[PDB]
Amino acid sequence: TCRLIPATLYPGRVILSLDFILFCLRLMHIFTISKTLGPKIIIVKRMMKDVFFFLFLLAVWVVSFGVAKQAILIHNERRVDWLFRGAVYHSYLTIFGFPEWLTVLLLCLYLLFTNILLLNLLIAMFNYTFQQVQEHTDQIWKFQRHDLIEEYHGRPAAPPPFILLSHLQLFIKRVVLKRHKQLKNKLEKNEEAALLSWEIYLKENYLQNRQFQQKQRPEQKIED
Amino acid sequence: PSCLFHSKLQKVLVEDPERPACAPAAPRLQMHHVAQVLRELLGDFTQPLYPRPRHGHVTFTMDPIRDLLIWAIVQNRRELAGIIWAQSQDCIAAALACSKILKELSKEEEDTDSSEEMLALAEEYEHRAIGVFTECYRKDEERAQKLLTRVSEAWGKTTCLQLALEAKDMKFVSHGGIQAFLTKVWWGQLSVDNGLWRVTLCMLAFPLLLTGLISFREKRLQDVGTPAARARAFFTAPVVVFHLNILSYFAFLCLFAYVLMVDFQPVPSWCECAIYLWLFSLVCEEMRQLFYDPDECGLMKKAALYFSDFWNKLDVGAILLFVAGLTCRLIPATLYPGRVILSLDFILFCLRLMHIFTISKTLGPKIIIVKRMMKDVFFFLFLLAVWVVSFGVAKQAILIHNERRVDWLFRGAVYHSYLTIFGFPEWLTVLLLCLYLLFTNILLLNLLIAMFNYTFQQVQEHTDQIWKFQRHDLIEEYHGRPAAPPPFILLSHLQLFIKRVVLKRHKQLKNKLEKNEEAALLSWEIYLKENYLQNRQFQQKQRPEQKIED
Amino acid sequence: FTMDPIRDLLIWAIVQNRRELAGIIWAQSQDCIAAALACSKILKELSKEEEDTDSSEEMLALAEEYEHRAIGVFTECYRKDEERAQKLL
Ligand SMILES: [Ca+2]
């Protein structure tokens, strides 16, 4: 829509840049199917949840620092984008990386605060996060394996420039008037009777081993 | 005489000064003496247990078995106290008092074997209190809530809940039903389940509350809609007063920031004077926070319990810095001094807003760890300061001419040291830069890694229970506070100040019940105890060591 | 009569956290691998809304025991004849 406006071309163009960035994270989806990478992706999806609420606190801190530095070290000014954007770029240079006593006090306050304590918050919060994950992660991945296979099993076979050839036939078949039979099927009644009888045979073979090895706990022996 | 309590009683009785005239030197032992040492062991908030006589066949006390329990519990007699607890009168107060006494006593023991048993006994009594209360909760909940807010006549006119608070009774307060009671206090007159966003939206509009917008419990207010009473009952709830104070504090910050950025003058403005009025209102609210005395206590001890609070310390440092800065702005000759002083004030207020995140479900536990690691990061940073001072004096001595300048070379080398710490000449330069790279970029980072591993390893998962224990006093402080946002809290201060000019807690946290009611309540309690005890001893019969002994 | 009686009695005995009663009447069930998983699902969906600190632990451990029962039957039926055992899922 913005590119259809010729008056906002350099707006609209860079909007289609940000779109591009989103597509990149989509490709990280591929590494769920690996043996060895998916377990790591699980932990990233874990730690997003608290790194968000940490980053808000970081934002309030750097805002307080910026307003303090703008108030202590300028003349009385209400400029539109000269001094405010200049001090914002100075704060970006500080955060990305007699005047004697006041300068020493300002730089030592910055060094003691923004270079120290919130790093320790991150160390503690991510220790509490990564300590919790333990080794359950392989089972979490094995449980996570199924729905991908489901979604690709249901999908038609064409790559998406040719998926319209699939969409047309299905749309005209559902125009006029059911899972696949490899994941859910209603069996024959005569077959299902034999299957259930086999099952109910095997249960009684399970139960004897269950109670017999339950007879070998030591508390049972002391009771006997 | 081997115990610690005997030595403390002897140190009191020998220092007893008001026994001048007798046949002997050591006068006697009176009951007010052991009452006096018990009050100092137990805490300031209770009254003295035994009265001092102002002066038969058989003189009896108010409750006998209490006294025998105290005697058997100060001497670490375990199996004796376990017997005579079973005949007690009001048990949930008793188990918590005997936990508090043991925790206050086991600190001063200084014997490596007595302290462990004297602590494990207190843990067992916490278990007994939980075990009785979880029965009485399951039988009838709404009567069981009346058990916590009762004031006990036996244990020096206190309640059960405050006694559990002072003893750091961690596993007790994290019980389910007591947390439900705390939440039911917190959501106030209205129901507890209507979420937070709907609370913000009815905070936004006056007649939305007059519409069918929100909930209510005690349906005489929900069905019969008397909107003046509904508005008063809506504003009485402490969540509402919390959100109102948060909004007023936010607008206070924004307008203070605007008057500090561009609207600063030597002459006082009018947007300035309004902000000074709102900060005067804040300091009078903190004044009535300090001066409020529900029960008579130590006024110096009242000041001590005030200043022990972290946020009280931050609030009073902010207000003293503010009045000093207003004094400096009243000097026209130090305007650019005074102005930037009012900048630093602003920074303090920002940390006050971090206080908000204690009330969250998921953030408060993280704030606990920050409050933990401040204590050692301070003493690390001092060592960092001595190291960078040594480096700076070394670099200034090796690489300059002989100079004693005022602020040219010293401040230039200080800025060079700040550029180094924030981020033939061949052999000497390589030696200097490699010494810097090996020292200030390596080893103290490893000190931090080790110290914060030793810190964060220790926290474990207790932190949720620490937060649940930390939940109470905030609800207390907001329950006691008047309802107005602080530009209008003067309207509250005037009426209370003129009522205390001429001549008591609220009755939802401490109430003296009817005598006839309290008899029925205690009989119900003493019924339920015997139902607890059978299950206790019966499941104690199923440990395997018992079976081998049998 | 209903379509299957013992299903209904299992549901009744499992919603009320009756342990040793349900352990008996599971043994006469008709199609067991569905039954143990349904009774695990009901207990996990129920133990969230319990809000009592002692009921939730037992109501969870019962569901873990029924997961164990389902695994224990299915690992027998897998070992006897695999290609028929895939038809069971
Ligand atoms: Ca305060």
- DSSP letters of B154-172? TTTSEEHHHHHHHTT-HHH
Count CA atoms within 13 Å of residue A30 on its CB side: 6
Name every chain B residue with its beta carbon within 8 A of the beta carbon of C51. 176, 180
* Secondary structure element (H or E) that encloses residue A163, with its range: none
Q: Are B173 and B469 in contact (CB under 8 A)?
A: yes
- Please tell me whether residue B440 adopts helix, strand or coil conformation: coil
Q: Please indicate whether, in this complex, the C-beta atoms of C73 and A210 are within 8 angstroms of each other.
A: no
Mark A92-129 as b/e (b = at least 16 C-beta within 10 Å). Answer: eebeeeeeeeeeeebbeebbeebeebbebbebbbbbbe
The residue type of A31 is F
d(CA A108, CA B409): 19
Chain A residues contacting B via beta carbons under 8 Å: 50, 53-54, 57, 60-61, 64, 67-68, 70-72, 76-78, 97-100, 103-104, 107, 111-112, 115-117, 120-121, 123-125, 127-128, 219, 222-223
Query: How big is the B-C interface in CB pairs under 8 Å?
Result: 6
Alpha helices by DSSP H, listed for B399-462, are 409-422, 425-439, 443-459
C-alpha distances out from residue B236 to B191, B492, B509, Å:
13, 14, 15
Alpha carbon distance B484, B245 (integer Å): 8
- 3-state class of B182 per DSSP? helix
Q: Which residues pair with residue B151 across a beta bridge? A: B159
CA dist., res. B252 & res. B278, Å (int): 8
Cα-to-centroid distance, B352 and ligand 1 (Å): 10
B100-118 burial, b for 16+ CB within 10 Å, e for fewer?
bbbbbbbeebeeeebeeeb
List Cα–Cα distances, B395 to B192, B276, B364, B405, B433, in angstroms: 65, 48, 45, 16, 11
| CA geometry: angle B176, B180, B182, nearest 5 deg | 120
Residues 6+ apart with CB under 8 A from B549: none
Nearest CA in chain A to C31: A196
Whole-angstrom Cα distance, residue B315 to residue B303?
Answer: 14
| Residue labelled with tokens 């009815």 | B202
B150 φ, ψ to 5°? -75, 145
DSSP string, B214-272: S--SSTHHHHS--HHHHHHHHHHSHHHHHHHHHHHHHHHHHHHHHHHHT---SS--HHH
Identify which of A195, A196, A203 has the shortest CB distance to residue C73: A203
Give first-to-last CA distance, chain B, whole Å.
38
Q: What is the DSSP string of B470-525?
A: HHHHHHHHHHHS-SS-TTSTHHHHHHHHHHHHH----TTT-B---HHHHHHHHHHH
CA distance B360 to B242: 13
- C→A contacts (Cβ < 8 Å), by residue, are 27, 30-33, 72-73, 76-77, 80, 84, 87-88
Q: Give phi and psi for B370, each to the nearest 5.
A: -65, -45
Distance of CA B297 to the CA centre of its chain: 17
Shortest Cα distance from A78 to chain B (angstroms)? 6
Nearest residue on chain A to C29, judged by CA atoms? Answer: A200
Chain breaks after residues in chain C, where C lies over 2.5 Å from next N: none
B375-392: string of b/e by CB count within 10 Å (b at 16+)?
Answer: eebeebeeebeeebeebb
CB A144 within 8 A of CB A33: no
Chain A interface test: which of B422, B453, B543 (most A C-beta within 10 Å): B422
CA distance B246 to B244: 5
Taking the C-alpha atoms of residue B117 and residue B357, their distance in angstroms, rounded to an integer, is: 39
CA A108 – CA A102 distance, rounded (Å)? 10
The rounded Å distance from CA B282 to ligand 1 centre is 10
Amino acid (1-letter code) at residue B259: V
Please tell me which of the candidates B346, B410, B457 has its beta carbon nearest to residue A68: B346
Q: What is the DSSP letter of B152?
A: E
Using the CB atoms, write b or e for A57-87: b if 16+ within 10 Å.
Answer: beeebeebbbbbbbbbeeeeeeeeeeebeeb
C17 contact partners, CB below 8 Å, separation of at least 6 = C55, C58, C59, C62
Contacts of B175 in chain C (CB under 8 A): 53
The sign one gets for the Cα dihedral A91, A94, A95, A101 is negative
Q: Which of A51, A54, A65, A52 is nearest to A95 (CA)?
A: A65
Dist. CA B364–CA A45, nearest whole Å: 22
Among chain A residues, CA nearest to B456: A124
What three-state secondary structure class fits C75? helix
Q: How many CB atoms lie within 10 A of CB B84?
A: 15
DSSP-assigned letters across all residues of B97-115: HHHHHHHHHTTS---TTHH
b/e string for A166-179 if b means 16 or more Cβ within 10 A? eeeeeeeeeeeeee
User: How far is the C-alpha of B441 from the C-alpha of B420, rounded, in Å?
Assistant: 10
Backbone breaks in chain A after residues (C–N over 2.5 Å)? 97, 177
Alpha helices (H) in chain C, listed in sequence order: 5-15, 19-25, 32-46, 55-80, 82-85
Range C26-35 contact pairs with CB under 8 angstroms and sequence separation of 24 or more: C26/C69, C27/A203, C27/A207, C30/A196, C30/A200, C30/C4, C30/C6, C31/A196, C31/A199, C32/A199, C32/A200, C32/A203, C32/C69, C32/C70, C32/C73, C33/A199, C33/C70, C33/C73, C33/C74, C33/C88, C35/C7, C35/C10
Cα distance between residue B391 and residue B152, in whole Å:
64
Tokens of B216: 């209510």
Helices A38-72 and A117-133: crossing angle, nearest 10°? 160
Q: Measure the CA angle with vertex B126, ends B85 and B294; round to 5°.
A: 95
C-alpha distances (whole Å) from A217 to each of A210, B41, C71 are 12, 50, 21
CA B100 to CA B169: how far, in whole Å? 8
Q: In this structure, are residues B474 and B180 in contact, taking their beta carbons and an 8 Å threshold? A: no
How many C-alpha atoms does B170 have within 13 Å on its Cβ side? 9
- Please say whether the beta carbons of C63 and C40 come within 8 A: yes
- The Cα A71–Cα A69 span in angstroms is 5
Rounded distance between C-alpha atoms, residue B316 and residue B300, angstroms = 17
Picking from B111, B67, B106, the residue whose alpha carbon sits closest to that of residue B88 is B67
- CB of B168 closer than 8 Å to CB of B103: yes
**C54 vs B134: CB contact, 8 Å cut-off?**
yes
CA distance C68 to chain A (A): 11
B334–chain A nearest CA distance, Å: 14
Closest CA–CA distance from residue A31 to any residue of chain C (Å)? 28
DSSP state of B24: S
- Method of structure determination: cryo-EM
Alpha-carbon span B94 to B70, nearest angstrom: 10
Q: How far is CA A43 from CA A33, A129, A133, in A?
A: 16, 9, 7
Angle between helices B463-480 and B364-398 (to 10 degrees): 100
For B138, which residue in chain C has the nearest alpha carbon? C52
Given the DSSP bridges, would you call strands B151-152 and B158-159 parallel, antiparallel or unpaired?
antiparallel
For chain C, which residues lie within 8 Å of any Cβ of chain B, measuring from their own Cβ? 51-54
Give the number of other Cβ atoms within 10 Å of residue B309's Cβ. 14
* Residues in chain B whose Cβ is within 8 Å of chain A: 257, 260-262, 264, 339-340, 343-344, 346-347, 350, 353-354, 362-363, 366, 369-370, 373-374, 377, 381, 407, 410-411, 414-415, 418, 421-423, 448, 452-453, 455-457, 459, 544, 547-548
Q: Which residues contact A95 (CB under 8 A, 6 or more apart)?
A: A62, A114
- Crossing angle for the helix pair C5-15 and C32-46, to the nearest 10 degrees: 30
**Ramachandran angles phi, psi of B169, nearest 5°:** -70, 80
Q: Which residue of B has its CA nearest to A103?
A: B415
Which phi and psi (to 5°) does residue A187 adopt? -75, 175
**CA neighbor of A202 nearest in space, from B49, B109, C1, C72:** C72
Q: How far is the CA of B265 from the centre of ligand 1 (A)?
A: 31
Nearest to B273 by CA among B206, B329, B235: B329
d(CA B164, CA A209): 51
